[PDB]
């Protein structure tokens, strides 16, 4: 399962510079988002100095 | 009749070894300059050292309670 992983990854997606590119662009899409979630979620957890301020001052 | 954390913390800080010695040297100079007339050795320096030792310790402890 492990060797065949990197292998299959090469087989189906890496040879043809086509797919190789098709994947990195498609892989950049999902990544950009998942990185911005975790990253912001991290920025929040170490803080909580703004935003939950909203639940207080407004709500109308 | 207010709560002045600065003053509360200043007291205990203003106490400590370092500060005593500087306040000691301060009063020494204080009186030295008080008991003289036509002198210009003006006692400014000794105050500052006292503040440094005091205010350094003021920062480490202060905010800890401040709301």
């Amino acid at each position: 399962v492990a060797p065949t992983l990197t292998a299959r990854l090469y087989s189906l997606l890496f040879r043809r510079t086509s797919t190789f590119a098709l994947t990195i662009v498609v892989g950049a899409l999902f990544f950009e988002r998942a990185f911005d979630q975790g990253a912001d979620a991290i920025y929040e957890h170490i803080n909580e100095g703004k935003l939950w301020k909203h639940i207080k001052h407004k709500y109308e | 009749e207010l709560v002045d954390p600065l003053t509360t913390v200043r007291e205990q800080c203003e106490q400590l070894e370092k500060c005593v010695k500087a306040r000691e040297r301060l009063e020494l100079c204080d009186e030295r300059v008080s008991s003289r007339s036509q002198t210009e050795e003006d006692c400014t320096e000794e105050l500052l050292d006292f503040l440094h030792a005091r205010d350094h310790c003021v920062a480490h402890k202060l905010f800890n309670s401040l709301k």
Partner: protein, 241 residues
């Protein structure tokens, strides 16, 4: 006079690397600006809209601007009236001509607070300590009871009165307003006036470290892989005879 003392390092809640500003503490600080300094200190680079995403809400921001009379454009008669104050309005306040600061006080310019934290040396630390460390003259020097005394100030002698315990106040959910607790706030606000971007960059900074912490080794291995060929090359010299 020609000798000095440098500020301590107060544990601000934004002194840390990836540390955001306390926004609740920027409000209080704003309020501190509105009543106290705003009658002596210019803050030309901040506007009511700037406060919107930061502390207050849209509506809250408007009403605050609407509590002054401005001077909108001329109309038909080549005039100049006065207006409630929008959002597009800045905080240009005290005195028109510079010398009007002077005439009011005695010489002495109360410098604009839009850029103070970034323009002294020691940021909020110097301002906070100048505000808080107000003290009484040692000996051998008399002022002019105009030039108040200050240790955290160049020449230790200069111009501004300590309006920091004279207490005003208005913290909706409330907080005691001592000299100190009101100082952290004006300072925590003064940082943001000098650098509104403060928090945003530190978020990118976090991303910048996380990203580089992934790209750096990755590029290294790419460069390692290609140099492979030269790192393991073996030579042999086979001359004749």
């Amino acid at each position: 006079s020609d000798l000095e003392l440098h500020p301590p390092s107060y544990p601000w809640s934004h002194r840390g690397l990836l540390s955001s500003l306390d926004h609740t503490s920027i409000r209080r600080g704003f309020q501190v600006y509105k009543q106290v300094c705003s009658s002596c200190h210019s803050m030309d680079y901040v506007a009511y809209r700037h406060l919107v995403g930061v502390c207050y809400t849209e509506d809250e921001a408007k009403a605050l601007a609407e509590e002054v009379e401005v001077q909108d454009g001329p109309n038909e008669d080549g005039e100049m009236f006065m207006r409630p104050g929008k959002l597009s309005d800045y905080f240009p306040k005290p005195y028109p001509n510079p010398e009007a600061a002077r005439a009011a006080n005695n010489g002495a310019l109360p410098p604009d607070l839009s850029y103070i934290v970034r323009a002294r040396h020691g940021g909020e630390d110097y301002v906070f300590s100048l505000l808080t460390g107000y003290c009484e003259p040692p000996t051998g020097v008399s002022l002019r009871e105009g030039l108040y005394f200050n240790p955290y100030f160049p020449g230790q002698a200069i111009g501004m009165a300590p309006p920091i315990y004279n207490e005003v106040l208005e913290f909706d959910d409330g907080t005691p307003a001592t000299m100190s607790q009101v100082a952290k706030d004006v300072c925590t606000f003064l940082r943001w006036a000098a650098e509104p971007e403060h928090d945003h960059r530190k978020r990118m900074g976090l991303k910048m470290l996380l990203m580089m912490g992934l790209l750096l080794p990755l590029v290294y291995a790419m460069k390692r892989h290609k140099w492979s060929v030269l790192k393991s090359r073996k030579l042999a010299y086979r001359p004749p005879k």
